[PDB]
Amino acid sequence: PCKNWFXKTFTSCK
Numbered sequence: 001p002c003k004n005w006f007x008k009t010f011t012s013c014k
Protein backbone atom coordinates (compact mmCIF):
# COMPACT_ATOMS: atom_id res chain seq x y z
CA PRO A 1 0.00 0.00 0.00
CA CYS A 2 3.08 2.23 -0.08
CA LYS A 3 4.22 3.72 -3.38
CA ASN A 4 7.24 5.94 -3.85
CA TRP A 5 7.26 7.39 -7.39
CA PHE A 6 10.44 9.40 -6.98
CA UNK A 7 12.11 7.84 -3.95
CA LYS A 8 12.38 9.27 -0.42
CA THR A 9 11.06 12.63 -1.54
CA PHE A 10 7.50 11.32 -1.86
CA THR A 11 6.08 8.63 0.53
CA SER A 12 2.46 7.57 0.04
CA CYS A 13 0.93 4.85 2.23
CA LYS A 14 -2.84 4.52 2.04
Ligand SMILES: *C(=O)CCCCCCC
Nearest residue numbers: 001002003004012013014
Ligand atom coordinates in the same frame (compact mmCIF):
# COMPACT_ATOMS: atom_id res chain seq x y z
C1 LIG B 1 1.08 -1.96 -1.10
O1 LIG B 1 1.85 -2.92 -1.13
C2 LIG B 1 0.36 -1.41 -2.33
C3 LIG B 1 1.19 -0.38 -3.09
C4 LIG B 1 0.60 -0.12 -4.47
C5 LIG B 1 0.58 1.37 -4.80
C6 LIG B 1 -0.37 2.13 -3.88
C7 LIG B 1 -1.01 3.31 -4.59
C8 LIG B 1 -1.90 2.87 -5.73
